[PDB]
């Protein structure tokens, strides 16, 4: 995977590529590595696919219950603390590597969490196998005081570095924009720069090509 | 890492580099390794980032609860709570921690807690991978009851050297000043400290 987070003026943006791998094989050409923890707190996850989905839902569930119990909008630092303490308890065996971002009554926030449970704060971050390709771009183009549109470009540029230069990353760019005072906008397949070319030939077979031994109607009813 | 804490005339100063490593890759070049566990009790963290954060969070929690029931804890007490954690979980922890705080009775104090969870009260303390390279320097240049400016210089010069030789240290030099006057955060960038 490649994943990033970039702070801007009024908020924060995260992005991720969309490739899943089983060894050298591409298991999924278009999976969603951007997760909603709460409406205005989103998560990008690299590492063990099931772990990032499961840990993200669990904490999303508990955050919802907490938000209801307190009559308050959830804060990013609560997701951060809950995620980190859970991951620490599991001593690294839950392989989730996350960039957590969002807006809340306190402001806009950007964090990363490694699987053993340490957290980092920054204006720009990247994680995953593509993180060095992305970080090269971020270190080259990031500045203090980015506008929303500059931040989006910077983020998806960083994801693109991963897509092209990292064999662990490919296909599309997903983005999510969390601006203060506005709804989060989740931009699924924001960029699609890897459209399969038209195939040379249609492999649709003459009907009857396949030798059959038996048929029968299956009973799905009651 | 490179970290240290130094007592002086008016209190104590903590200093640290800002590098986190994942092998030879720098995962974070602007880390904050100086962490608050109470208004005027802070610690420097070295070793595992996850272990030291988890420890500092628990200690902050104990001291918040201490405060609620019995008032401001002494620096010695804070160091004791770190020890208890580090000693009792010595098999599972990679944490080298320096504790530093300011009382009005006791002035500045420094306690260092190496890997096994032993405790050592000292005039100053150095630790982290980069500290090996400055034992000579620090032993030769430290005196008691330095001024604030002298102590900032001692720390700046020392960590400068540790950062120069240690590949696992770098970025900015952060310091935290602890006196009766409050709490002051200092930062020094490469272009300044490198050519000292």
């Amino acid at each position: 995977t490649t994943i990033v987070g970039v702070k801007f003026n009024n908020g924060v943006v995260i992005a991720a590529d969309t490739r899943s791998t089983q060894g050298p094989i591409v298991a999924d050409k278009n999976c969603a590595k951007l997760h909603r923890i709460s409406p205005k707190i989103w998560c990008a996850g690299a590492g063990t696919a099931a772990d990032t989905e499961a840990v993200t839902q669990l904490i999303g569930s508990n955050i919802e219950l907490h938000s209801l119990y307190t009559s308050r909008e959830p804060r990013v630092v609560s997701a951060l603390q809950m995620l980190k303490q859970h991951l620490f308890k599991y001593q690294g065996h839950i392989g989730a590597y996350l960039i957590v971002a969002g807006v809340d009554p306190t402001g806009s926030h950007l964090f990363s969490i490694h699987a053993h449970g340490s957290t980092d704060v920054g204006y720009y971050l990247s994680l995953g196998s593509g993180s060095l390709a992305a970080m090269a771009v971020l270190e080259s183009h990031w500045k203090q005081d980015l506008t929303k549109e500059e931040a989006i470009k910077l983020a998806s540029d960083a994801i693109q570095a991963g897509i092209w230069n990292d064999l662990g990353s490919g296909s599309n760019v997903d983005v999510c924009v969390m601006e203060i005072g506005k709804d989060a906008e989740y931009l699924r397949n924001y960029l699609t720069p890897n459209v399969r070319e038209e195939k040379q030939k249609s492999y649709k077979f003459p009907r009857g090509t396949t030798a059959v031994l038996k048929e029968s109607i299956v009973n799905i009813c009651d | 890492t490179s970290i240290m804490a130094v007592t002086f005339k008016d209190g104590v100063i903590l200093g640290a580099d800002s590098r986190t490593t994942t092998g030879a890759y720098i995962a974070n070049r602007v880390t904050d390794k100086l962490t608050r566990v109470h208004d005027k009790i802070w610690c420097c963290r070295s070793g595992s980032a996850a272990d030291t954060q988890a420890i500092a969070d628990i200690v902050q929690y104990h001291l918040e609860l201490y405060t609620s029931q019995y008032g401001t804890p002494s620096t010695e007490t804070a160091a004791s709570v770190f020890k208890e954690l580090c000693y009792e979980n010595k098999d599972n922890l990679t944490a080298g921690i320096i504790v530093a705080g300011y009382d009005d009775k006791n002035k500045g104090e420094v306690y260092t807690i190496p890997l096994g969870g032993s405790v050592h009260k000292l005039p100053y303390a150095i630790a982290g991978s980069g500290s090996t390279f400055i034992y000579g320097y620090c032993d030769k240049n430290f005196r008691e009851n330095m001024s604030k400016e002298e102590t900032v210089d001692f720390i700046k010069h020392s960590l400068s050297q540790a950062i120069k030789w240690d590949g696992s240290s770098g970025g900015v030099i952060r310091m935290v000043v602890l006196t009766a006057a409050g709490v002051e955060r200092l930062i020094f960038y490469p272009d300044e400290y490198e050519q000292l």
Binding site: - | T22, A27, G47
Partner: peptide, 4 residues
Amino acid sequence: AXLX
């Protein structure tokens, strides 16, 4: 894992 991240060291210091």
